[PDB]
């Protein structure tokens, strides 16, 4: 239509012809805003920026993001972006226009649900939810089920923790019967998910643990499986110790050993230890469970591994109570309770947008000042999203409004390293990683402090680590790299507060990185060849600058896993620079994750890749991340 206000007209007046029901695609609110500002809004759009995408990147928007009329695309990309900008900012036209420009130029983007839903009548802009199992009763299980069903009407993922449901064989008052345990109850939630993804969180001392970790096994032992949901372990340090030292581990039903999931560290160890001596559970060899874990991971990629004590000891939300899960993708570490369902408010900064080639020659630099700036903008966007969001359930509204947690992420890390000619595993990639995550943390906390000065600190700020001057890297007992002035930031925080309980959680970017044409989040390249036929564009240009690219190359690069090691007409500096993730030591991956993590409020989704997997390599890879103090030891195990 080439006129934003007109496509807003069409989308707003849309009527479902099949039924005769008016089916508005835009909220009253955002429609009134567009009309009262139609000239400023319409002439702000730079339609030239629609060509600033790729083919497969534009096709991702076209296939799934751009609003449609009669199955016909009704929005151009600039319209979608301006819709999202207004959906976020409402009446703040100048804030909207800035977000429009920065997003359209590709400095950052917002998570899928924001892009779908910003500026529509039910604007559910948040990626995921962390649900507490409400109580160990039919009532609690079915109240929780209803809530998960309600959450799934507008979709976005669910992380659900079930440490409190009594295991198989457990006694039930007023009946001859005993509990069926977890698996049967998991099958109820699976079925609801199917009717209307799910991650399930459990502590490894739970007596149904062996069955739980095989939830995704292929060999179908009938009604003891549930493929559809993802198991995630919530691992206490004691577990890992016992495995390392080859000792024992005791399985309990939470009704015979209550409170285990309501404490952590030493208080857990003491309470767990007392329960073991009172013969309340069933003892086995720690390594028997360990073995079963790694078999499940080797075969299914699951369960995920997130360290409970690391999460809780190093969370600014520790004044709230004990955090009992993470989320679907293993980056969110936010408190939940029967009446508080934690929400993920996500957006990603495009890291390559800050590469500048300044003062002639091959020299490119990285603009940390512009990064600091854009991270400040996204932090403010994300706060606007807390408030303007549609909450599918009241538990989620209560959680978000009370603690106001935010999750800033990144995309194009690998892209950034490659454009700057840095091998992922170099000392220069290692330093740039630290600096980026430092500036993003400093900027988000600075912007959040500004917000606290304007609107007050979040309700639960007092008594929090941040209020006592304890920032994230402090909880790792480190000094910050020191590109930014932390003293002054910390001073202002203790004086004024921050608006957000939490700020950082580098997530799986997935389809929001496909649109901008960057590699997923903070990962390296899985292949120098994706899909059709597309080779790594940075690699492709280097092979064309040596004049060696042709068809006697496209074949090779295909039937060779997208790898370039072992190509004879290829300089060593190129091999170093375009290692596949299978070709990078996972020790380097974990080291670099440990570096950035001192600057991460929450966690981050650490996918791990093992070429020639053995139970010994996996065990070592796990204990390495664990001794590194990682919160998320592992998202998916990818293999072979």
């Amino acid at each position: 239509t080439k006129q934003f206000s007109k496509v807003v007209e069409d989308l707003y007046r849309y009527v479902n012809a099949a039924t005769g029901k008016p089916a508005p695609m835009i909220s009253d609110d955002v429609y009134n805003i567009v009309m009262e500002n139609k000239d400023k809004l319409n002439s702000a759009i730079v339609y030239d920026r629609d060509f600033q995408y790729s083919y497969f990147g534009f096709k991702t928007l076209e296939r799934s993001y751009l609003l449609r009329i009669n199955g016909q695309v009704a929005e151009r990309p600039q319209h979608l972006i301006m819709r999202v900008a207004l959906g976020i900012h409402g009446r703040d036209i100048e804030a909207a226009l800035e977000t429009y420009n920065l997003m359209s130029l590709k400095y950052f983007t917002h998570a899928s649900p924001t892009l779908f839903n910003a500026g529509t009548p039910k604007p559910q802009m948040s990626s995921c939810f962390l649900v507490a199992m409400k109580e160990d009763s039919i009532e609690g299980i079915y109240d929780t089920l209803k809530e998960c069903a309600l959450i799934s009407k507008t979709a976005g993922g669910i992380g659900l923790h079930i440490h409190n449901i009594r295991s198989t064989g457990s006694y039930i008052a007023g009946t001859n019967g005993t509990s069926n345990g977890l698996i049967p109850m998991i099958r109820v939630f699976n079925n609801t998910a199917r009717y209307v993804a799910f991650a399930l969180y459990l502590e490894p001392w739970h007596a149904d643990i062996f069955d739980f970790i095989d939830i995704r096994k292929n060999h179908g032992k009938e009604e003891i499986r549930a493929r559809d949901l993802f198991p995630a372990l919530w691992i206490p340090d004691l577990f890992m110790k016992r495995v390392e030292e080859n000792g024992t581990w005791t399985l309990f039903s939470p009704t015979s050993a209550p409170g285990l999931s309501d404490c952590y560290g030493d208080e857990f160890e003491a309470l767990y230890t007392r329960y073991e001596k009172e013969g309340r559970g069933k003892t086995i060899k720690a390594q028997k469970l360990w073995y079963s874990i790694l078999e499940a991971q080797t075969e299914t990629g699951t369960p995920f591994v997130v360290y409970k004590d690391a999460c809780n000891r190093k969370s600014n939300q520790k004044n709230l109570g004990v955090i009992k899960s993470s989320n679907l993708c293993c980056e969110i570490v936010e408190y939940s309770a029967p009446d508080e369902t934690a929400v993920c408010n996500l957006a990603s900064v495009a890291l390559p947008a800050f590469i500048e080639t300044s003062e002639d020659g091959k020299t490119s630099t990285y603009n940390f000042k512009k990064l600091h700036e854009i991270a400040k903008v996204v932090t403010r966007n994300l706060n606007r999203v807390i408030d303007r969001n549609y909450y599918p359930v009241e538990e989620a509204r209560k959680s978000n409004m009370r603690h106001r947690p935010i999750a800033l992420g990144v995309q194009g890390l690998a892209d950034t390293f490659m454009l700057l000619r840095l091998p992922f595993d170099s000392e220069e990639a290692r330093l740039l990683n630290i600096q980026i995550f430092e500036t993003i943390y400093h900027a988000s906390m600075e912007a959040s402090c500004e917000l606290a000065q304007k609107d007050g600190p979040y309700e639960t700020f007092q008594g929090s680590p941040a209020s006592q001057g304890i920032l994230q890297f402090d909880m790792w007992d480190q000094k910050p790299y020191g590109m930014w002035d932390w003293d002054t930031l910390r001073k202002d925080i203790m004086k004024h507060g921050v608006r957000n309980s939490l700020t950082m959680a580098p997530m799986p970017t997935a389809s929001t990185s496909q649109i901008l044409g960057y590699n997923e989040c903070f990962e390296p390249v899985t292949s120098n060849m994706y899909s059709f036929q597309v080779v790594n564009p940075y690699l492709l240009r280097d092979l064309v600058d040596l004049g060696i690219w042709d068809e006697g190359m496209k074949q090779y690069l295909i039937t060779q896993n997208g790898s370039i090691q072992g190509l004879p007409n290829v300089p060593q500096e190129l091999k170093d620079l375009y290692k596949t993730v299978w070709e990078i030591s996972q020790k380097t991956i974990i080291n670099m994750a440990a570096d950035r993590s001192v600057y991460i409020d929450q966690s981050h989704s650490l996918n791990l890749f093992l070429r020639a997997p053995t139970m010994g390599k996996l065990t070592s890879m796990h204990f390495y991340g664990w001794k590194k103090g990682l919160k998320t030891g592992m998202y998916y195990l990818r293999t072979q």
Partner: peptide, 7 residues
């Protein structure tokens, strides 16, 4: 089980 290896 072996904790301490090349991965």
């Amino acid at each position: 089980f072996t904790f301490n290896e090349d991965f």
